[PDB]
Amino acid sequence: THFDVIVVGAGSMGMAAGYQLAKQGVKTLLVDAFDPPHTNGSHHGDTRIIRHAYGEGREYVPLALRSQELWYELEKETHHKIFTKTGVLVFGPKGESAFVAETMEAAKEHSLTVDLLEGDEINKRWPGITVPENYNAIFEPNSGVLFSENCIRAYRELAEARGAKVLTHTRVEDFDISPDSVKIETANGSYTADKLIVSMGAWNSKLLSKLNLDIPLQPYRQVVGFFESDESKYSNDIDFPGFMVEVPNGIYYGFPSFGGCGLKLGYHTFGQKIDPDTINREFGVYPEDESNLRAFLEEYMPGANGELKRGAVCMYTKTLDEHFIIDLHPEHSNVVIAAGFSGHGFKFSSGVGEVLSQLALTGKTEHDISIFSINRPALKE
């Protein structure tokens, strides 16, 4: 019940941190409210996009590239499938998309490998896409799709084999922080360590107040749907890409069909404000769930608009500036916080696990994480 490090929340970020700590022989306890991977947090629905040319900001590119190399390393270490190089297509109306423009600027700044296309060039290259002639695109061939549940399961199995312990179905209810130690309280007992990593996903919005932190964090209910599609156009086997696109009523993202699962789509810039303990996790309970998806499909990917095969309900946790929080607690250098991933953190989770392990062990990281500071002005109302 004493450890070197305790990770609270063994999800996307926490489980990666656990792997990085265990690989260094650091005796780690991970505590999760469920049994990860699971369907109650932010990491299910099978698949996640990884992009390198980064439309949310060119400053994420180093972490994206480091994370990509870590995912290739993970592929080699496990029998679970980690990554498929689908490429990622980004498109939008010419001159009317900040996301597209920043994606292009990031690629230029970092000498990333991309193709530039416009109008009917897009429809011709990828049968099944129907964009207007005034749309332009940037395609990144060497990014792709992560199997997110498999990533967390592989990190867990590898960490446990090296002696990490995973206490499941155990909610942390409170914390007690001292100068020279950390303590968590649960119904199944209290545990102590030298250092704490706090990575509770959407529950960071509810429980960071138990560490005397007051940070705006808003959970959002974000659905995805898998649709019966024309496999001769939308299969990964015919090189249909992953995508993240801007259109006049917002940003949508999606995935090619893998083994006939259907094209998967989500709507990024809308979701319901929720609390993670009362969210309705059934797909289709609000009319928007299915209708906002088919509105996009009928316009832009009309042969991927068949029967709904599967739906899922997941959560984002947004900061006011939609940048992450990765830092030491301002009052407690033995406490590390990972929060506020704002709907775009999974791809970085391998690199973030490395950052969190460095912060926990040394109070520093070799990564540049200034944009993720817990003290920055734009976090606050």
Q: Does 352 bind ligand DPR (CB under 6 A)?
A: no
Least distance (Å) between residue 51 CB and ligand DPR: 6
Q: Does 52 bind ligand FAD (CB under 6 A)?
A: no
Helix (H, G, I), strand (E, B) or coil at 329: strand
> Could you confirm whether 86 is annotated as catalytic?
no
Minimum CB distance to ligand FAD smaller for 96 or for 275: 275
**What part of residues 81-140 is at the interface with ligand FAD (CB under 6 A)?**
none
Angle of CA points 32, 34, 36, to nearest 5°: 80
Compose the 245-284 pattern: x for residues touching ligand DPR by CB under 6 A, - for all others. Answer: --------x------------x-x----------------
Least distance (Å) between residue 53 CB and ligand DPR: 11
**Is 10 labelled a binding residue?**
yes
Closest among 167, 163, 150 to 77, alpha carbons compared: 150
From the list 264, 318, 323, 329, the catalytic residue is 264
Least distance (Å) between residue 316 CB and ligand DPR: 8
Angle of CA points 236, 53, 154, to nearest 5°: 55
* 262: exposed, middle or buried (Cβ count in 10 Å: 0-12, 13-18, 19+): buried
Least distance (Å) between residue 51 CB and ligand FAD: 8
Please, which residues bridge with residue 138 across strands? 90, 116
Please, which residues bridge with residue 87 across strands? none
**Is 285 labelled a binding residue?**
no
Show the DSSP H helices in 192-287 as ranges: 204-207, 231-234
What number of chain residues touch ligand DPR (CB under 6 A)?
8
Sign of the torsion formed by the C-alpha atoms of 60, 66, 67 and 72: positive
Cα separation, 242 vs 239, in Å, equals 9
Please choose, out of 88-96, 104-112, 124-132, 343-351, the segment that lies near ligand FAD by the rule CB under 6 A. 343-351
Q: Does 45 bind ligand FAD (CB under 6 A)?
A: yes
Give catalytic residue positions.
Answer: 44, 47-48, 264, 268, 314, 347
